[PDB]
Write a protein that binds this DNA or RNA. Sequence first.
RNA 1: GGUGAAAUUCUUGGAUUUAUUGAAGACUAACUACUGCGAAAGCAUUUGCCAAGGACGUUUUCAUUAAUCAAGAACGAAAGUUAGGGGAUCGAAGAUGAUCAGAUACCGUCGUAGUCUUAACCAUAAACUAUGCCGACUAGGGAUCGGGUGGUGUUUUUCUUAUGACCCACUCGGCACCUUACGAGAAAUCAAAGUCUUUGGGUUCUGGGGGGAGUAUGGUCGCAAGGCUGAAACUUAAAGGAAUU
Lengths: 215, 127, 97, 62, 81, 25
Amino acid sequence: RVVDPFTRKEWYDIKAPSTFENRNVGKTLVNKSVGLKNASDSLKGRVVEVCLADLQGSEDHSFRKVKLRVDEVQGKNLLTNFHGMDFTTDKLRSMVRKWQTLIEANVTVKTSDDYVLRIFAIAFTRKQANQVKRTSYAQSSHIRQIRKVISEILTREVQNSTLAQLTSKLIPEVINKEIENATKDIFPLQNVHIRKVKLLKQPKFDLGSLLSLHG
Amino acid sequence: SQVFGVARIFASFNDTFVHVTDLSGRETIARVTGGMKVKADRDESSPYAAMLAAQDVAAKCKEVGITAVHIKIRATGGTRSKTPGPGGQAALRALARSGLRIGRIEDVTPVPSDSTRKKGGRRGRRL
Amino acid sequence: PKKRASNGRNKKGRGHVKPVRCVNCSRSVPKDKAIKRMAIRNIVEAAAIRDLSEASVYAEYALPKTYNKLHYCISCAIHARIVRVRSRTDRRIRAPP
Amino acid sequence: PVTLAKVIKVLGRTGSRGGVTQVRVEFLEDTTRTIVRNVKGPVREGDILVLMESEREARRLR
Amino acid sequence: VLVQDLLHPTAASEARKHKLKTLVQSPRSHFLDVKCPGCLNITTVFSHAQTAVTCESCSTVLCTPTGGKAKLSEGTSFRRK
Amino acid sequence: MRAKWRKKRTRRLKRKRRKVRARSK
RNA sequence: GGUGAAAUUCUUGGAUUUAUUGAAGACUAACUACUGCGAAAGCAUUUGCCAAGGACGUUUUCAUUAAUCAAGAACGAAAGUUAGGGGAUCGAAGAUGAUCAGAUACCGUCGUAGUCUUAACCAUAAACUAUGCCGACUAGGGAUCGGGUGGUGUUUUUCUUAUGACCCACUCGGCACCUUACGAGAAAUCAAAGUCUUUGGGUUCUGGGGGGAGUAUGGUCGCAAGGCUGAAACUUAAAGGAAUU
Ligand SMILES: [Mg+2]
Ligand SMILES: [Mg+2]
Ligand SMILES: [Mg+2]
Ligand SMILES: [Mg+2]
Ligand SMILES: [Mg+2]
Ligand SMILES: [Mg+2]
Ligand SMILES: [Mg+2]
Ligand SMILES: [Mg+2]
Ligand SMILES: [Mg+2]
Ligand SMILES: [Mg+2]
Ligand SMILES: [Mg+2]
Ligand SMILES: [Mg+2]
Ligand SMILES: [Mg+2]
Ligand SMILES: [Mg+2]
Ligand SMILES: [Mg+2]
Ligand SMILES: [Mg+2]
Ligand SMILES: [Mg+2]
Ligand SMILES: [Zn+2]
Ligand SMILES: [Zn+2]
């Protein structure tokens, strides 16, 4: 018996939400539709990980990955919704050098459009111009203050208009900039990166929302 | 312009895997396990075997449709080694020089935030 | 006699700290005697870059680099490995070379 | 399959027993490649070296 | 160092040493008379005030004590007397 | 010779002696 | 799978591997240092709380209230013992493949106690910085950590100060260094191990060749395991410290 999985495999093409400048991202190669267990209910819970520097074209976002879950099934086409704005393992580790303090802010939030999200913020103290002090630390209480400020900023940003706006904001890193602007008055800080985004709870399937991210 | 695959190299200290998946990763294209190509168990961590495996995978894939490839690399970890062993680099080289286009190499080694008590037992492994 | 004024390593105004398991022997060794070489290496060989540049989608993408902090414990810090053995005279040099 | 590459520089001599040379091979078909190769025996600069092996390479001999 | 006069110390050397370590144990603290923008007369405030301070009649904060010295609010004029 | 081992042996002997005493009792 | 080699075990049941989630229990990497804190042992997810603590400030207050302390107490790692929960992981015994002259030893594979807890006990460690503690002084130098002071100090900008992070100058307190000896060392080494033949700043506690020996006998404290305390007979001329060829 022939067991070759090319005759019994279907070649679909992945479309990213209207938040990203590139329409099509890649080619998902799943299963040729046979009666019972059809390639429509077979999908959904399949998440594609892809970078932003292909989705935008700009190589400023060469770091950081984006996770996209299947939410829309069409005729010989799959349309996806956002899931997890994560970070590249090599870039975060290159940010972590000796001497500078790593500040990790971790916030659980709820969306206005009814979704449970988790946002992490990895920050570093900077050896600014004219510093003879070879080491570059913080002062523990200062770290805590910074974390609190970051949490406040996250609360401000989230609970305000959907995931689609949040994703857009993430795209050219505006949140980071705003945090830097805020926290410059407590402790210097370089990088200040949003790193990881984790979505937890999805209540309904919906349709309108899915549509609104395509056109 | 190009069809993109995901390589997912598991070249741990003992055996290599060139387990080429989709883009979500749920459906595999071709795997060809690194230690299958050479039936000498000394030559499983060997670069040559890995290279051969990679070549085989390229033959399966490049001459069927997939032209471009993102390369994930992990040589185990968590409790094991956390370090790229012999066979990953060789595999990558093979992939490059068989003719397949590269879509950004990356390392996804499982690194814990401090894990369970790993093997050895305090005094550890004795060579 | 004591080989070092630092006796072991680093445990001063501290004491009885936290253990690390090693790279190769995987043995329980204090996070001071630990010996941390710290490996920064690009994913491919030094000669296996030109070829990659020639055959790739993303033209002029440059390289990712692995950052692996090794915990090469005193015992298995030496086979033909790093740190060697220094003269009892020239042991009081803390410099990275 | 047949390949051949000219030698240009010797990267010393390595081996437990010794004798076996580490060479830098440059391909006369496309000079863009300079590979580290294991060569057994007396070898200088500017010699055509036939290779049954296509891509596999090793440095140290132990 | 052969001979140093440990009875006539120079004005800089004494400054270098702290408070009690000098030959005459005297405070470095000069506590001040204040001229707040509201009131019309002088009031005494310590340089290291410990607790919260009021000027005269109205409960106006003059100095916030943080660490060593006192953080004088807004900007007032003061002398050592 | 190791001292720890010796100590252990001594302890064992002591235990044995105790047992013997108990038996006698 | 596994190592320097293979071999056990798991397998067309789809093993391994690739996603997704879920389950559980410990553990908090990278930041992590000649750095913090604490009476030590110890301690590293954050944020809430509940108290405590040094250090620093200080034209406060008290007024010798102190230093060390046989007694007696409070804590005290890990293993271990009792119960009850939890039971992923590693793993004493226990199997099982090897290796071996022989492995019940190192290597490999599984695996009950235990690890983690809530209640008890236990009280030892190379509980080590092998340096009792509180003092006082003698030497130079940076570097931090913590809090203070002065900067016509610099970029920070929202005009401008005011902060906070920076830079220099100082100190005060701490962990530590590096350099010498001019001392002390038996030296190795040491800013204390210095002020010790010019030998008495205060105090506790120990040791008197090695072995027998931390044993035997008592006593106690313990559910037990053991801990505290602690000999002698006999036995030998060495045991040992540091350095040197
Ligand atoms: Mg094991
Ligand atoms: Mg301390
Ligand atoms: Mg958990
Ligand atoms: Mg941590
Ligand atoms: Mg710290
Ligand atoms: Mg326990
Ligand atoms: Mg046997
Ligand atoms: Mg056994
Ligand atoms: Mg074992
Ligand atoms: Mg098991
Ligand atoms: Mg004791
Ligand atoms: Mg002692
Ligand atoms: Mg200014
Ligand atoms: Mg401050
Ligand atoms: Mg005696
Ligand atoms: Mg007794
Ligand atoms: Mg002797
Ligand atoms: Zn080691
Ligand atoms: Zn007023």
